């Protein structure tokens, strides 16, 4: 019976602080409407005024579903701004109230609570740990763990998935371990869904859980998900390639055994398309991913070789963008540092020398040194075959010596020393 669209913040406060049930609802919805426009939700105002612990009390009203809905929405939108704003919501005691709301028989209310808990947890690790500490995980999973999720609207599923993802998201600290153990089985299952937003959200969640110590990598790999990650990595028609790749790249920063789960699940067969993908970001992340594989054991470098990936790295090292070329360098250096003499010979056959040397004119010190170390590594294989003299002439006759000599008049002492060592040892 009123113009809730055109109430003022003042009107709201009087409305809320009233003892009349209908004006309370009316106020709460006027609030909701203001927070729902684009042009500057008066968020600070609402807090200033001391409404949050009233809204929080409204969440408690089982008697009045509409007032639960209206405050949930209102709080959600507060909680979707700054840390201070989000904090006001938390300071108000929203969290345990929202968790109680998760079990409402009204789906629209439950899902509003889910959405709010997503934002609280999305702030960072502290509020995320608070949401987990207050007991959010069991009820969230109960909504998704099911014989009947099929009965959930896709918007809801996506909403839950995104919230779960936020619960898996930051570090310093990473999430509690037993919460992750509890959640992972749902994630693994959601990785077989067909909705592209569910898939992307759960893949990014897996990606976060795989970004840290070996211990974390290990709990993910043990679920048996990695073959599924590789099937997604192959879905070149979908945007899901990116998160699946992130998660696979993360897995191969772990133990040799963890890296070997990726290889055995059959990931390397996908890489020819990943390194030729026109989307340059995918090139980079696949080249980064490669470089941690060529940093692995000799039988692992050999699988990279057997799948024909080495001419692809050379290709990338030669003709891709500088960011992706950096990663190419890392793959080469790790390869030369861990590889057998044969493996190194084959790399030289694939035309590694010139593109590798081209990148010595790079204005990045860390990368000049790893190029020099890789060359140095190639010369040691040449020592063992007595071909150092051959390798020297060739490097001289393709401009390589110019680029190494160039480096003696460089400012960094290390670059100067490493390059001088090469000139001495092999070009004197």
């Amino acid at each position: 019976n009123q113009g809730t669209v055109n109430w003022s913040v003042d009107d709201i406060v009087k409305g809320i602080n009233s003892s009349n049930v209908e004006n309370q609802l009316q106020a709460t919805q006027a609030a909701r409407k203001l927070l729902s426009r684009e042009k500057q939700p008066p968020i600070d105002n609402i807090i200033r005024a001391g409404l949050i612990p009233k809204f929080v009390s409204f969440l408690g009203r089982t008697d009045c579903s509409p007032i639960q809905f209206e405050s949930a929405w209102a709080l959600t939108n507060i909680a979707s701004g700054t840390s201070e704003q989000t904090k006001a919501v938390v300071d108000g005691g929203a969290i345990p109230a929202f968790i109680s709301l998760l079990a409402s028989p009204h789906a629209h209310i439950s899902e509003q609570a889910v959405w709010a808990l997503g934002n609280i947890a999305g702030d960072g690790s502290v509020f995320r740990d608070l949401v987990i500490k207050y007991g959010a995980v069991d009820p969230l999973l109960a909504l998704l763990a099911v014989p009947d999720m099929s009965s959930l609207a896709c918007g809801y599923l996506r909403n839950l998935t995104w919230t779960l993802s936020n619960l898996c998201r930051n570090k310093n600290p990473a999430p509690p371990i037993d919460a992750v153990e509890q959640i992972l089985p749902t994630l693994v299952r959601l990785l077989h869904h067909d909705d592209p937003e569910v898939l992307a959200d759960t893949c990014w969640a897996i990606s976060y859980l795989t970004d840290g110590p070996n211990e974390r990598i290990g709990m993910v790999v043990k679920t048996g998900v990695v073959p599924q990650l590789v099937k997604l990595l192959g879905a070149s028609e979908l945007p899901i390639v990116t998160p699946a790749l992130r998660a696979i790249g993360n897995i191969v920063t772990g133990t040799d055994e963890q890296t070997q789960v990726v290889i055995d699940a059959g990931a390397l067969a996908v890489f020819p398309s990943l390194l030729t993908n026109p989307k340059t970001n995918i090139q980079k992340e696949a080249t980064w991913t490669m470089s941690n594989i060529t940093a692995g054991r000799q039988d692992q470098i050999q699988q990279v070789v057997n799948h024909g990936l080495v001419p692809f790295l050379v290709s990338v090292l030669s003709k891709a963008d500088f960011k992706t070329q950096k990663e190419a360098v890392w793959a080469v250096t790790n390869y030369t540092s861990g590889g057998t003499v044969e493996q190194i010979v084959y790399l030289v056959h694939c035309g590694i020398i010139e593109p590798l040397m081209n990148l010595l004119t790079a204005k990045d010190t860390k990368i000049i040194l790893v190029i020099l170390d890789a060359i140095s590594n190639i010369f040691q294989a040449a020592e063992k075959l007595g071909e150092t003299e051959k390798l020297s002439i060739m490097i001289e006759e393709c401009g390589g010596l110019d680029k190494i000599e160039a480096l003696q008049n460089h400012e960094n002492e290390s670059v100067y020393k490493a390059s001088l060592s090469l000139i001495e040892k092999y070009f004197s």
Binding site: R246, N250, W288, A295, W330
Partner: peptide
């Protein structure tokens, strides 16, 4: 043999 590089490293 070299160290693996984490995503932070790129």
């Amino acid at each position: 043999r070299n160290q693996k590089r984490k995503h932070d490293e790129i």
